């Protein structure tokens, strides 16, 4: 009964570091042939609040959106708990999110002092201190901006192509 259509069919998706969350308070998902990943956890796939989180990542990173994974995305951008209750859904979005010259508008967080807690969101852009000298908010050697653009081109390999992800947690 929940109106997921606004989430899955949204015209624009968030960068993974600034992942979007929508609060809502199931047969159409299986019959979709566009979904390339569909994995549910802690529930029989066949609820007070349901949270729909959505973002874009690269194809070879979709595996990190699962309980117990590691990598830049799971570590620094979007982290699921070990006891996750919900579903992860993804589909290739090369046709919407790639561009011949390259689409660079989607970002991910490249540096962080510690790993995200589950469902934590970090949208800060503090200069990252990679060495012993403090940075005082100034970019320079060992003092780095912490976000990095994806480079989505339609002729890249599928693992480098953009995927839209929706995480439904109950």
């Amino acid at each position, epitope marked *: 009964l929940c109106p997921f259509g606004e989430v899955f069919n949204a015209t624009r998706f968030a*960068s993974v570091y*600034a992942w979007n969350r929508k609060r809502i308070s199931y047969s159409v998902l299986y019959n979709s042939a566009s979904f390339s990943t569909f994995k549910c956890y802690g529930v029989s796939p066949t609820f007070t609040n349901v949270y729909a989180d959505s973002f874009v990542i690269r194809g070879d990173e979709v595996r990190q959106i699962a309980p117990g994974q590691t990598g830049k995305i799971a570590d620094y951008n979007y982290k699921l708990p070990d006891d996750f209750t919900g579903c992860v859904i993804a589909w290739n979005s090369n046709n919407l999110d790639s*561009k011949v*010259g*390259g*689409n*660079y*508008n989607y*970002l991910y967080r*490249l*540096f962080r002092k510690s790993n995200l807690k589950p469902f934590e969101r970090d949208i800060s*852009t503090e*200069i990252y201190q990679a060495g012993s000298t403090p940075c005082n*908010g*100034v*970019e*320079g*050697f060992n*003092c*780095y*901006f912490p*976000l*990095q*653009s994806y*480079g989505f081109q339609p002729t890249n390999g599928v693992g480098y192509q953009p995927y839209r992800v929706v995480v439904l947690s109950f």
Partner: nanobody
Amino acid sequence: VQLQESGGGSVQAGGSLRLSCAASGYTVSVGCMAWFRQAPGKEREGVAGIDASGITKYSDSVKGRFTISKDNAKNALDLQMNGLKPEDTAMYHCAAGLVRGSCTDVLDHPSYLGVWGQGTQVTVSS
């Protein structure tokens, strides 16, 4: 967080253009930022870079003709292009946010800048 370039188009050889890259969620004043360009089927070239200290570097092909500067009123990075040549025809691309190395080599290392705009086409006709 994004960079948005504008100011490109068509111009006669010998003419002038000013590119601008408006930054959202990114403070240009304290940033390392650069302009690159790519002519079709050809290798990307760094044209002008600037560091937090206000120190600029130019490629040999544009020195004496281009000036890179920070606009802190609009929070944008500007590129003044004078004495334009058919040579200069290319997609011009702005990048910001040092993620590796030092700002002084970014013209040779575009991957050392994390955030990239969409590009703006400049076509110089003879």
